[PDB]
């Protein structure tokens, strides 16, 4: 792991000491190589997980998030290359440094053994995101968005610190291997239900729940792009990972402190997908879809079954890839029209007949297409929920219907129709922004060809 996060640190001098004309290239290529060397930790020939030190470990839940975080960086970096091309070189390099800092801190999170390491890094991730959203957003609502996105997190996370501190004072170590093998059943009192809530309602904010999600549209809609990629791809999964790690020390309270959150997730998933059915803003449509997806992950982690954790991991990775892809696809048009309004430009597939295939595949990923790690996750958590209660499929099916609807409606009212003939500024395409979608989709196909990796702790 050290061999993954030291080169990631060396990517920063590589930015600052290189020419202005040979800085995107070098850092992009070397980031791809970091992604390559982040495959050694998929060499798990055994059941025992990979401990490299007291600091760092890597389980089959860590490794996909690690690899995806190392893999997104070149994509963020190339997507961020048309805008801030007319920016001063120092400003460019500051953007690069923030993205690399995100990479490093997120790898450290997913590789951490203790919960306090994970805490300080889970919170250090806020500073790059806030800077990216605020200094490089295009609109004026970015400031309120940053405030929301920061303070929801901090409100949720201060109780988390208090609970971790309590657990240290009670057990002594706060390490995840030892909390696994030494976990006392809880006495089922209010003093422990508050502990459950303090441990959970930091991650549940970040995933997010439907009661608390207003930070995610305001941020996705206003972050330039790369912030949106990350905020859709791994910052939401940074809560699911934490829940999967911390739930082991909360049994048996999860059997009854989970009803409200499963229920909120399910109903609010339906609510969010219905919103996606009727939404003027494309970058908000993607965001509400992300809420409607992560709600299933919430319910799944609450059920704590093998099928459920499995499907949660699958849906995590799949949603991350396809959501980053859809944000790229919307940015591709926003870099020309400079409008997020979707019904503005609605008759493409004449000018962009190849991007319109990436659109289609991105949507089919989004809706439940079977030979895909999206439907595998959605199906397995549907099966877990049916085992839990047979009356949940009534809601999952409504979601499936609406999720076909808003995705196909997006495709239709953006591509299909009559071309907006008043748009002379529809430049043909960028090889860069075609390679982007290819690099988002080719992993989906590969992982569908081999989902033995993309499962989690339980398979």
């Amino acid at each position: 792991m050290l061999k993954i996060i030291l080169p990631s640190l060396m990517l920063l001098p590589l930015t600052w000491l290189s020419s202005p004309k040979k800085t995107w290239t070098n850092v992009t290529s070397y980031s791809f190589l970091i992604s390559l060397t982040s495959l050694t930790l998929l060499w798990q020939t055994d059941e025992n997980y990979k401990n490299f030190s007291n600091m760092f470990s890597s389980d089959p839940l860590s490794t996909p998030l690690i690899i995806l975080t190392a893999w997104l960086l070149p994509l963020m970096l190339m997507a961020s290359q048309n805008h801030l091309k007319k920016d001063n070189n120092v400003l460019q390099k500051l953007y690069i440094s923030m993205l690399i800092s995100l990479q490093i801190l997120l790898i450290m999170t997913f590789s951490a053994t203790e919960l306090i390491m994970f805490y300080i890094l889970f919170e250090a991730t806020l500073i790059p995101t806030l800077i990216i959203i605020t200094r490089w957003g295009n609109q004026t609502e970015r400031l309120n968005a940053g405030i929301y996105f920061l303070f929801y997190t901090l409100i949720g996370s201060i109780p988390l610190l208090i609970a971790l501190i309590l657990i240290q004072n009670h057990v002594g170590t706060l390490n995840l291997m030892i909390l696994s093998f030494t976990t006392h059943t809880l006495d089922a009192s209010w003093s422990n239900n508050l502990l459950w809530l303090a441990c959970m309602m930091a991650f549940l904010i970040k995933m997010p729940l439907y009661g608390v999600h207003l930070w995610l549209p305001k941020a996705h809609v206003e972050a330039p792009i790369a912030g949106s990629m990350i905020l859709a791809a791994i910052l939401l999964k940074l809560g699911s990972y934490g829940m999967i790690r911390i739930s082991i020390i909360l049994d048996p309270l999860t059997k009854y402190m989970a009803y409200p959150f499963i229920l909120l997730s399910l109903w609010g998933m339906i609510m969010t997908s219905s919103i996606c059915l009727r939404q003027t803003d494309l970058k908000s449509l993607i965001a509400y879809s992300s809420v409607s997806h992560m709600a299933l992950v919430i319910a799944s982690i609450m059920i704590q079954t093998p099928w459920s954790f499995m499907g949660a991991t699958m849906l995590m990775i799949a949603h991350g890839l396809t959501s980053s892809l859809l944000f790229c696809l919307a940015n591709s048009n926003y870099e020309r029209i400079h409008s997020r309004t979707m019904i503005m430009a609605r008759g493409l597939q004449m000018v962009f007949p190849l991007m319109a295939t990436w659109w289609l595949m991105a949507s089919l990923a989004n809706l439940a297409l079977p030979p895909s790690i999206n439907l595998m996750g959605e199906l397995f958590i549907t099966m877990s929920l049916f085992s839990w209660s047979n009356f949940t499929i009534i809601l999952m099916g409504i979601n499936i219907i609406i999720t076909g609807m808003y995705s196909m409606y997006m495709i239709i009212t953006t591509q299909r129709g009559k071309l907006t003939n008043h748009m002379i500024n529809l430049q043909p395409s960028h090889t860069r922004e075609l390679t982007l979608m290819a690099l988002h989709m080719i992993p989906l196909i590969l992982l569908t060809t081999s989902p033995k990796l993309i499962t989690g702790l339980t398979m």
Binding site: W136, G137, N138, Q139, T140, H338
Partner: peptide, 19 residues
């Protein structure tokens, strides 16, 4: 098209001694 930076109406709210 262009990045938005503040204007005088946005700055004048930080000149009132009490905010």
């Amino acid at each position: 098209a262009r990045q938005w930076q503040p204007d005088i109406e946005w700055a004048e709210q930080f000149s009132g001694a009490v905010m």
